[PDB]
Write a protein that binds this ligand. Structure first.
Ligand SMILES: [Mg+2]
Ligand SMILES: [Zn+2]
Ligand SMILES: [Zn+2]
Lengths: 182, 73, 928, 186
RNA sequence: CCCAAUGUGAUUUUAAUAGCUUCUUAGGAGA
RNA sequence: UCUCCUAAGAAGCUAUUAAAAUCACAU
C-alpha cells in the first residue's frame, strides 16, 4: 500500500511537472511524494530483510533435518557391528573361564589365549619357521594346533614342501601360517 | 649438474614403476625402494649411475609394459 | 724394619697372607664417593680419603684376590666409643669383622682399628659411577664390571659399548650385578633389626657398606633403651633407587624359592589382584622406609602420595606375569543377549581400579553407551583370532581379520618446470654451496611394524623419589602464570572437524559426524562418566607421506574420538591460556613474524651475567620417555582443578589418561598389540606435556650439578648455604618448604634462563658459574639422560655459542642473523635453502605440478625465503629472487592461457604486488 | 564510461562549472550542484552494479579454468610420466644407460635385475643372430658397459646349445630366441 | 585405503561495527 | 522564504572486527 501511495503521488506530481503548474502546489506535491517514498523505502527495506531471513530459517531447518538423518544412520551401524560380534563368541569355552574366576571377572589378554579356535603365526625367516611351526602340528599357549594353510606376503598359497633351507631365497617372506585348535 | 639430474630421474623412474603396479610383488618392490633410497643419499656419481642401471633394468625386463619403440621418438 | 711387626699385627689371630698396598707405616690416599651432611658441607660427591693404610690378601697359592684389610688411627675417646657400639652389633651377620689395638709410631702409642675382608669399592662408588656417567672417565665402572665377572676386559674395545640404543647387549652386562645388589638390600634389613634390638640410633649411608653388603663406621651412632633403636634411611634408599631397575635386582623373585637355579613360578592364569604379594615385597627390602605405601593408588591422599606409591609399583610390577595387566572384563546382559565389556583396569603404576557405574542388566543402549561399548577393546579382542607375531618383541593380543595388512609409501611427484627454471638461473651447479638434500623417501610393506618395534627402547625406570618430589614443586613454579579448569560442551573450540575419529569410528565418518550427532547434554554426560569410570580405547598407527632429510619412516598416533572429546573438555582452558601468554619460559603460541623472533631472543638474554648460549637433543624421545615422568606431567597440568574437581574425580581422570595414551592397545596392520609406555604423539595434550618433561630434565640437571660439587671449594658464602639447604629439603624434610622452593626458583631463573617449545630448547646461562659447577652444563645432561631416560646423548648433536651477536645456532629448525632494519639492528630467522628448494621441486599430489593453479603456494614459500636476501653468501641470497621471478612467469602464463581459453582477460591485475620485495619485507617489521 | 548516468553526470558537472565561470547567483549554483548530486548518486549506483557483475563473471571464469585444467593433469598422468622419463634419460647421456635402452628396442631384454657385484649371475634374451654377432665375442658377452663370461646358452625349447653351433650358416636350424646366461667379469 | 595433537602465516568470501558522502522528511534557530 | 543545525529513512565509499575455506611453515 506504501508502493501504491508512492506510485499515485509520482503521477500526481508528474502531471503538474508536465504543464509546469505552480511551485506553490509543486512543493506540496513533492512533499507528498517524498513522504510516501520514505514510507515505501521503510516497507521495502523490511521486506528485503525478511526475504533474506527466510533463506536463513530454511537452510537452518535443512541442517537440523540432515543431522537427525546422519545420527539415525550411524546408530544402526554401531548396533549392527555389536550384535554381529556377539555371534562369534563360543559361549561354551567363554563360560568355562568366567565361571572359574573369583569375582566373575578376568584379564582381557587371556580371552584369545584360552578361547580362540584359530591362530595366525607371522614368520620373518626360515630359522624362525623351523623353531615355531616345523611339520604339520605344533604346540603353543599350552595347547596343540594343526596347520590348515600357509600364505606368503603377496597372499599366494605356499605348500609345506616348498619351505626349505634350499628354496627359502625364492619365497616372499614373511609367511603367515593359519592353524586350528586340536 | 649430473648428480642433481640423476637424483631427479630416480624420482620419475620409481613413479613409472609404481604406476605399472610393481607394488603387487612384495619381493620386487622392496628392491626398487632400496635402489631409489640409495640413489638419493649417494655423494659419488659413479655409485649413483651403477644403481640407476639396476633400477632401469626392472622397467626394461617388464616385456609389453611400455611401447619402448614409441617412447624413443 | 718397623713395617714388618706392624704388618704381622694387622694379620693378627686371622688366617691371612697380606701384601701392603703402599708405604709400610704411613697412610694410603684414595679418591672415593661419599654421601655427606655436616655443619660445614652437604652433598654426594668425590673426596680424597687420607686416614687409612691398606693391605690386600694373597690366596694360599701366591695370587692376589679381592679382599682388603683397612687400618686407621683414632683419638682415644673415639676408639673407646666405636669399640662400645661394635660390641653390641658383634653377633650380627651383616657387620664386617673389626680388631681394636694399640701400637707405636714415631716413638709413641697410637690406637688403631683394623677392618677385615672389605672389597676395593663400596655401594656409594657403584651408585656414583652409574648416576654421574661420562664415557671418557669410566675407569671405576670398568673395574667393577671386570672384578665381578659381568664381562671380559675385551668388551670395552667395541664401538659404543655403552649406548643403550646402539649396543642393547649392555643391559645383559648391567643385569649381572643384579643379585650382588639384592644381597646388599637383604643385609641392610638384618642390620636395621640389629640396631633396633640393641637400642642404637644413627644415620646409615651408602659409603659405609662394601660390595659384599657388610657394614662398618659405627663411630657416629649413639645409645638408647634396648627396645627402641632407630636406623635412619631416607638418603640410602633414595640414592640407590634408580640402580635397582637398571641392574634388574629383583629378577630372582620370579623363581621357585627365589632361587635362580630353580624354574619360574607358574602363576594362575585368571589372577589379576597381586595386592598381598606387593605388601610382602615391600616388607622384604624396604622394612624401615617409614612412609605409608598403598598398593592400589585409588587410596592415595594427594599428587605427592600418588608419585610416591606409583614409584614402588613400577619396581614390583616386574615380578608379575605380562597377561595380568590391562582391561578387566565381565559378562553383562543387554535385552537378554550376553555382552563382554571392560569393568576396570590393572595398571603397572596405579594398581587395580574398578568402575563405579557397572549395571549387569539393561533394556536398551543410548548413543552414549554405543560409543563406550564400540570404543572399548573388549568386544574386538574377544571376537578376534589369536596372534603369534614373530616380527616384534612387543606383546600381541589378537588379529581382527583373516589377512595381515602391509602398507607401502610412494615417491613424491616431480615439478619439472620449476627445476628447468632453477637450472636456467644457474642453480644445481657442480660444487655449489646450495643443493638438494630434502626428498620424499619410499617405503616397502615391512615399514609400519619396523617403526612400531622401536617401542623396545621403553624400559621400566624407578626414580629417586626424594629428588623427584622436590623437582615437581620447582617445575610447578614455571606454571603459576596461567588459569585452568573444566568447561561445558558449549565452550569447546575444535580447529578442524574434517579429520579422523580413530578406530572403529573411521568406518562411519570423520570427527564432524560425532560432534553433529551428540547434543551438548550427550557430550557433558560422556565427560561426567569419566570422573567415575575408566574407558580403555584403541589407537591407530599411521605412516606419514611428507618431505624429509632422512630415509626412515615416521608414524603418528590416531587416538579415538571418545578420548579426544573428553580430554579437550578437561584441559583446553589451560592450553588456551599457555598459548595466549607472552614473555614466559614456554613459547608455544608466539609467532616469528612482525618482530616476534627478536622479542623472544631478548627475553632469554634477560639480566644474565657472563652469558653463553646452549641447546641439546633428546634421543628417541617419544619412544624412550619413562611412565613416571609422563604421569608427573599429567599431574602438573591437573593442579589447576582445585576449585571444580574432588580428589576422587582427579584420580579417575588420571586413570583415563593412563588407559588411553600411556599403556594402551595399538591397532597396527589390522592387529592389536600392547604399547609399553611413552608419548602417543596425537594425544590432545602432546606439545604441552613435552614442555613439562623438558623443564623437569633441565631442573634435575641443576640439582645434580650443585649437590655433586665439593662444598669446601665454593668461594661464595651464599651458594654454600644454598647447597646445604638444598640437601636438607631434598633428603631430610618430608614436606614442602615454600620459601626455599621460591629461593631456588629465583636463583635458577637468573643464572640459567630457558626458552622451551615441546622437545626443543635454548638456554642462556652464566658461564662463570657453569665452569665452577654451580649450574648445569652439557656434561650434566649426558648423566641425567643415562640413568633417568635410558639413552646415551652424544655431544656431537648439542651446540654452544660464546658471542650473543650471532644468536642461537638453531631453534625450531631455523638459524638466526643480526641485521640492520631502519635505524637499528634486529634478529631475523632463516630456513635451510635446500628445504625451500626441495618443496618447490617435489610435491605430494599431481595437480600441484601445474604452477598456474598454485601461484599462492609460491607466495607462501617466498615469505619464508625472504630473510636469505641479507646473508653474506650470494648463493643463499639468490634463492628469494628465484621465487619472485617464477611468480612473475606463472602470472604471464596464467594470463596467456586464460585469454586463449575464453578470449577475455582478468580485470584483477592485483597479483602485481607478489613479485616485488615490499610485500615480503613488511612480514618482519614491528607495529604490524 | 558505458554507464548511461555518466552522460547525465558529465553534462550536470559541465553546467555547474559553466554557472560559476559565468559568475551566476549562488542559489543557481546550489540548484545545479543539487541536480549534480542526484545524477552522481545514480551514476555511483550503476557503477556499484558494474563492480558486482565484473567480479561475479571473473570468479566463475577462474573456477572453470581451475576445474577443467585439474582434470587434464589427473587423467593424462600415466602417458605424461613415461614421456617425461624417456626425455630425461636422453640428457644424462650415460654410456651404460644408452647401451641397455638401445638393446631393448631390438628386444635384447634382461630376465633379471642387472647385478653390480663381481661373479654375480645375469640372464638375457637374444632375438636373432644379427644381435648375437654384435653382442658376443668368443667366451664373452658385452652389455651395460661391462664384460660378462657365458656359462650356458639355451634355445626356445629349453635345450642347451654349444658355443660352436651359433654361426651365420647354421643359424636357421636353431630355435630362436635364445637365452644366454653369463657371469660378471672384472 | 588410511590420513593425530598443537601453534603460526598467507589467500578468498561473508557478516557486523564505526566513520564519511549525497538525497529526503521533520523540528528549531538565524537572517 | 532562505540559511544553518538536530533527528530519522535511503543510497555510495572506507576502515576494523568475526566466521568459513584454501595454501604454507614449526614442534
Ligand atoms: Mg634444539
Ligand atoms: Zn599412597
Ligand atoms: Zn576440573
Amino acid at each position: 500500500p506504501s508502493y501504491a501511495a508512492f506510485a499515485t503521488a509520482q503521477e500526481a506530481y508528474e502531471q503538474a511537472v508536465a504543464n509546469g503548474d505552480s511551485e506553490v502546489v509543486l512543493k506540496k506535491l513533492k512533499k507528498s511524494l517524498n513522504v510516501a517514498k520514505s514510507e515505501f523505502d521503510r516497507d521495502a527495506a523490511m521486506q528485503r530483510k525478511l526475504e533474506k531471513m527466510a533463506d536463513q530459517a530454511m537452510t537452518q531447518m535443512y541442517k537440523q533435518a540432515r543431522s537427525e538423518d546422519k545420527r539415525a544412520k550411524v546408530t544402526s551401524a554401531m548396533q549392527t557391528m555389536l550384535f554381529t560380534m556377539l555371534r562369534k563368541l563360543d559361549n561354551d569355552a567363554l563360560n568355562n573361564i568366567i565361571n572359574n574366576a573369583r569375582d566373575g571377572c578376568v584379564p582381557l589378554n587371556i580371552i584369545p589365549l584360552t578361547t580362540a579356535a584359530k591362530l595366525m603365526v607371522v614368520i620373518p625367516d626360515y630359522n624362525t619357521y623351523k623353531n615355531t611351526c616345523d611339520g604339520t602340528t605344533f604346540t603353543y599357549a599350552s595347547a596343540l594346533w594343526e596347520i590348515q594353510q600357509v600364505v606368503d606376503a603377496d597372499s599366494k598359497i605356499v605348500q609345506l614342501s616348498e619351505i626349505s633351507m634350499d628354496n627359502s631365497p625364492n619365497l616372499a617372506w614373511p609367511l603367515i601360517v593359519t592353524a586350528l585348535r586340536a | 649438474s649430473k648428480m642433481s639430474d640423476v637424483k631427479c630421474t630416480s624420482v620419475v623412474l620409481l613413479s613409472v614403476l609404481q604406476q605399472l603396479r610393481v607394488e603387487s610383488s612384495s619381493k620386487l618392490w622392496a628392491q626398487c625402494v632400496q635402489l631409489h633410497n640409495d640413489i638419493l643419499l649417494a655423494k659419488d656419481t659413479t655409485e649413483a649411475f651403477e644403481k640407476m642401471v639396476s633400477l632401469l633394468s626392472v622397467l626394461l625386463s617388464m616385456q609389453g609394459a611400455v611401447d619402448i619403440n614409441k617412447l624413443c621418438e | 724394619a718397623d713395617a714388618q711387626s706392624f704388618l704381622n699385627r694387622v694379620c693378627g689371630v686371622s688366617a691371612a697372607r697380606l701384601t701392603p698396598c703402599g708405604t709400610g707405616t704411613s697412610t694410603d690416599v684414595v679418591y672415593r664417593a661419599f654421601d655427606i651432611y655436616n655443619d660445614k658441607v652437604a652433598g654426594f660427591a668425590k673426596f680424597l680419603k687420607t686416614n687409612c693404610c691398606r693391605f690386600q690378601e694373597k690366596d694360599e697359592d701366591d695370587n692376589l684376590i679381592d679382599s682388603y684389610f683397612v687400618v686407621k688411627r683414632h683419638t682415644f675417646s673415639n676408639y673407646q666409643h666405636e669399640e662400645t657400639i661394635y660390641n653390641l652389633l658383634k653377633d650380627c651377620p651383616a657387620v664386617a669383622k673389626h680388631d681394636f689395638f694399640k701400637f707405636r709410631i714415631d716413638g709413641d702409642m697410637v690406637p688403631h682399628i683394623s677392618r677385615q675382608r672389605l672389597t676395593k669399592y663400596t655401594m656409594a662408588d657403584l651408585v656414583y659411577a652409574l648416576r654421574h656417567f661420562d664415557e671418557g672417565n669410566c675407569d671405576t665402572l670398568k673395574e667393577i664390571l671386570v672384578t665381578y665377572n659381568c664381562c671380559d676386559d675385551d668388551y670395552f674395545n667395541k664401538k659404543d659399548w655403552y649406548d643403550f640404543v646402539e649396543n642393547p647387549d649392555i643391559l645383559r652386562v648391567y643385569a649381572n650385578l643384579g643379585e650382588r645388589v639384592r644381597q646388599a638390600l637383604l643385609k641392610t634389613v638384618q642390620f636395621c633389626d640389629a640396631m633396633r634390638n640393641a637400642g642404637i640410633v644413627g644415620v646409615l649411608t651408602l659409603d659405609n657398606q662394601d660390595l659384599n653388603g657388610n657394614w662398618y663406621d659405627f663411630g657416629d651412632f649413639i645409645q638408647t633403651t634396648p627396645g627402641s633403636g632407630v636406623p635412619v634411611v631416607d638418603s640410602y634408599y633414595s640414592l640407590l633407587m634408580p640402580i635397582l631397575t637398571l641392574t634388574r635386582a629383583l629378577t630372582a623373585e620370579s623363581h621357585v624359592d627365589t632361587d635362580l637355579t630353580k624354574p619360574y613360578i607358574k602363576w594362575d592364569l585368571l589372577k589379576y589382584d597381586f595386592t598381598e604379594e606387593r605388601l610382602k615385597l615391600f616388607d622384604r627390602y624396604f622394612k624401615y622406609w617409614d612412609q605409608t605405601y598403598h598398593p592400589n593408588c585409588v587410596n592415595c591422599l594427594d599428587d605427592r602420595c600418588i608419585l610416591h606409591c606409583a614409584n614402588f609399583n613400577v619396581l614390583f610390577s616386574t615380578v608379575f606375569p605380562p597377561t595380568s595387566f590391562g582391561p578387566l572384563v565381565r559378562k553383562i546382559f543387554v535385552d537378554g543377549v550376553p555382552f563382554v565389556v571392560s569393568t576396570g583396569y590393572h595398571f603397572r603404576e596405579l594398581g587395580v581400579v574398578h568402575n563405579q557405574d557397572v549395571n549387569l542388566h539393561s533394556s536398551r543402549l543410548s548413543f552414549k553407551e554405543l560409543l563406550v561399548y564400540a570404543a572399548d577393546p573388549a568386544m574386538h579382542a574377544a571376537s578376534g583370532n589369536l596372534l603369534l607375531d614373530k616380527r616384534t618383541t612387543c606383546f600381541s593380543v589378537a588379529a581382527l581379520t583373516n589377512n595381515v595388512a602391509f602398507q607401502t609409501v610412494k615417491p613424491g611427484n616431480f615439478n619439472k618446470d620449476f627445476y628447468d627454471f632453477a637450472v636456467s638461473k644457474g642453480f644445481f651447479k657442480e660444487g655449489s654451496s646450495v643443493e638438494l638434500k630434502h626428498f620424499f623417501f619410499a617405503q616397502d610393506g615391512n615399514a609400519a611394524i619396523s617403526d612400531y618395534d622401536y617401542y623396545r627402547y621403553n624400559l621400566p625406570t624407578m626414580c629417586d623419589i626424594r629428588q623427584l618430589l622436590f623437582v615437581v614443586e620447582v617445575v610447578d613454579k614455571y606454571f603459576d602464570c596461567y588459569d585452568g579448569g573444566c568447561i561445558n560442551a558449549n565452550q569447546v573450540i575444535v580447529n578442524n572437524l574434517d579429520k579422523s575419529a580413530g578406530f572403529p569410528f573411521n568406518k562411519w565418518g570423520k570427527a564432524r559426524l560425532y560432534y553433529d550427532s551428540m547434543s551438548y547434554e550427550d557430550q557433558d554426560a560422556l565427560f561426567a562418566y569419566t570422573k567415575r569410570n575408566v574407558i580403555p580405547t584403541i589407537t591407530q598407527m599411521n605412516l606419514k607421506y611428507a618431505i624429509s632429510a632422512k630415509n626412515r619412516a615416521r608414524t603418528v598416533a590416531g587416538v579415538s574420538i571418545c578420548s579426544t572429546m573428553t580430554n579437550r573438555q578437561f584441559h583446553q582452558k589451560l592450553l588456551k591460556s599457555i598459548a595466549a601468554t607472552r614473555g614466559a619460559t614456554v613459547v608455544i603460541g608466539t609467532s616469528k613474524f612482525y618482530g616476534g623472533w627478536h622479542n623472544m631472543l631478548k627475553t632469554v638474554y634477560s639480566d644474565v651475567e657472563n652469558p653463553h648460549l646452549m641447546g641439546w637433543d633428546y634421543p628417541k624421545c617419544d619412544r624412550a620417555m619413562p611412565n613416571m615422568l609422563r604421569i608427573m606431567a599429567s599431574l602438573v597440568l591437573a593442579r589447576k582443578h582445585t576449585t571444580c574437581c574432588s580428589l576422587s574425580h582427579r584420580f579417575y581422570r588420571l586413570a583415563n589418561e593412563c588407559a588411553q595414551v600411556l599403556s594402551e592397545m595399538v591397532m597396527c596392520g589390522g592387529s592389536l598389540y600392547v604399547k609399553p609406555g611413552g608419548t602417543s604423539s596425537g594425544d590432545a595434550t602432546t606439545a604441552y606435556a613435552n614442555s613439562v618433561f623438558n623443564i623437569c630434565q633441565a631442573v634435575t640437571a641443576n640439582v645434580n650439578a650443585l649437590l655433586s660439587t665439593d662444598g669446601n671449594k665454593i668461594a661464595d658464602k651464599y651458594v654454600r648455604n644454598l647447597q646445604h639447604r638444598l640437601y636438607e629439603c631434598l633428603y631430610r624434610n618430608r614436606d614442602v618448604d615454600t620459601d626455599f622452593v621460591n629461593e631456588f626458583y629465583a636463583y635458577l631463573r637468573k643464572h640459567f634462563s630457558m626458552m622451551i617449545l615441546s622437545d626443543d630448547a635454548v638456554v642462556c646461562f652464566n658461564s662463570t658459574y657453569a665452569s665452577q659447577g654451580l649450574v648445569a652444563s652439557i656434561k650434566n645432561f649426558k648423566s641425567v639422560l643415562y640413568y633417568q631416560n635410558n639413552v646415551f646423548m652424544s655431544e656431537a648433536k648439542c651446540w654452544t655459542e660464546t658471542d650473543l651477536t650471532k644468536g642461537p645456532h638453531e631453534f625450531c629448525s631455523q638459524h638466526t642473523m643480526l641485521v640492520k632494519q631502519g635505524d637499528d639492528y634486529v634478529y631475523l630467522p632463516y630456513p635451510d635453502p635446500s628445504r625451500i628448494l626441495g618443496a618447490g621441486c617435489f610435491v605430494d599430489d599431481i595437480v600441484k605440478t601445474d604452477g598456474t593453479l598454485m601461484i599462492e603456494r609460491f607466495v607462501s614459500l617466498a615469505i619464508d625465503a625472504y630473510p636469505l636476501t641479507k646473508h653474506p653468501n650470494q648463493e643463499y641470497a639468490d634463492v628469494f629472487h628465484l621465487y619472485l621471478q617464477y611468480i612473475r612467469k606463472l602470472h604471464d602464463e596464467l594470463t596467456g592461457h586464460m585469454l586463449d581459453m575464453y578470449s577475455v582477460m582478468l580485470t584483477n591485475d592485483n597479483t602485481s604486488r607478489y613479485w616485488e620485495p615490499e610485500f615480503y619485507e613488511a612480514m618482519y617489521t614491528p607495529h604490524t
